[PDB]
Amino acid sequence: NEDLRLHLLLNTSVTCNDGSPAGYYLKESRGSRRWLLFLEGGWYCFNRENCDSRYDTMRRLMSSRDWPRTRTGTGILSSQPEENPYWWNANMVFIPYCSSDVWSGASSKSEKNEYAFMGALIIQEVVRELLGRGLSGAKVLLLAGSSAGGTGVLLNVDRVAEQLEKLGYPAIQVRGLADSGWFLDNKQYRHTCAPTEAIRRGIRYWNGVVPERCRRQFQEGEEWNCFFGYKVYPTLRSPVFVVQWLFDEAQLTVDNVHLPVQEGLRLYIQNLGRELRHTLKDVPASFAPACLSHEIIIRSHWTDVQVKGTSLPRALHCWDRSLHTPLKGCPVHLVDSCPWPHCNPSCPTG
Ligand SMILES: COCC(=O)n1ccc2c(Cl)cccc21
């Protein structure tokens, strides 16, 4: 099945990096008032040289010129209940990542700019155009995303909520689901841009924007702090469910860890998991399995992992119920406490 159909944005000034129109893939579910808007990930680029290399061999992440006219919705974007026990009947939207800016940019290609970085405006424009295609009738808009798209959720969920309020749709409840986008600004295991520096450069290169309360806390020159979940999350007003492997492969990569493990690395990995667990202690809606993985929630077998006997589709369903005191047999805070990758037997097998 190739069930989500491409729509290029009607406002063609809201563009991918190369000035081609951004867009979204949509499958409507008539009669459902739930809307899932999913932000794709795919790292980022932060200067002319690394963006030029990405343009040569990762061009779909910078341009819509070669996008297919359809995509198949998978995992949380699947419309089959067997693959998606959570939201199989929802209106499904997949927003391709073609701005290379962690969904933070508001800058057009121009005179002075080889590339456009418009991630934050792409989300705004997708929402605006969907209002005319049924989103105006929504009861819940869940802004979800994986990896850089998961960080994108944290950066954008409250702006979507504010946009809908200002446009006159106060009854749509905006919520976020940030998958694999909750990173630590920690020390590398071995020195090698530890993300903090690349994001600091990105913000200037992209004209990148962060949520307003977080911006007001950290102030000018320090907005990179808001790309780190544990710092931006407490400032958010919308409900946000956080999914994060305790030993996320991309976190390990930026930490310069590449997997017989000796004492120093064992301690480093154990400490990483404990720090991740610590940052989620006061996140009431979370799913954080003790796995080394790069797998994301749009994979078809996303249903298989469990924490304390509860799957992510079940936890997300419990979260929905909690947003109608904790619920009998329906938990929402699911963080592993065991200290080493795959100490949870249900971790993705690879
Ligand atoms: C697999 O993707 C990795 C990825 O996208 N990233 C890894 C570190 C990071 C930060 Cl610190 C902010 C935004 C995106 C990031």
Ligand SMILES: *[C@@H]1O[C@H](CO)[C@@H](O)[C@H](O)[C@H]1NC(C)=O
């Ligand atoms: C098109 O998008 C740009 C960027 O957000 C915005 O400035 C402009 O007002 C939009 N135009 C229309 C007609 O929506």
